[PDB]
Design a binder for this molecule. Structure first.
Ligand code: HEC
Ligand code: CL
Ligand code: CL
Ligand code: CL
Ligand code: CL
Ligand code: NA
Ligand code: NA
Ligand code: NA
Length: 82
């Protein structure tokens, strides 16, 4: 539940319903996530913490516990397709 709330507050601006309005080829749905190896909590949490390209780093914005919770939410949603 907390993971979904964090996602709504911090991630849905760019990734609503698992999309990516900024970088077409890097969404949160099964195909792109599997291709890029975002298939574990740790893989996702590392990317969220440090940022990448035009995506900001969240390591100074969200706590480690919040990053874990949102990463689990994204993993579950991706694996089951949003
Ligand atoms: C727009 C300002 C964004 C917000 C808010 C968040 N993300 Fe993002 N994300 C964004 C871009 C431009 C990209 C591509 C970065 C690149 O590699 O060039 C991404 C990518 C991801 C990914 C990887 C998806 C994939 O490879 O298919 C993940 C797992 C991801 N973003 C997660 C995520 C979370 C959990 C966010 C809130 C804390 C979040 N993003 C915010 C743009 C934006
Ligand atoms: Cl981009
Ligand atoms: Cl990537
Ligand atoms: Cl990373
Ligand atoms: Cl940043
Ligand atoms: Na909410
Ligand atoms: Na674009
Ligand atoms: Na801070």
């Amino acid at each position: 539940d907390q993971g979904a709330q964090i996602f709504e507050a911090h991630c849905a601006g760019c990734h609503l319903n698992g999309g990516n309005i900024v970088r077409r080829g890097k969404n949160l749905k099964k195909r792109a996530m599997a291709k890029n190896g975002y298939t574990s909590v740790e893989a996702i949490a590392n990317q969220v913490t440090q940022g990448k390209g035009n995506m900001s780093a969240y390591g100074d914005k969200l706590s480690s516990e919040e990053i874990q919770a949102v990463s689990q939410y994204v993993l579950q949603q991706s694996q089951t397709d949003w």
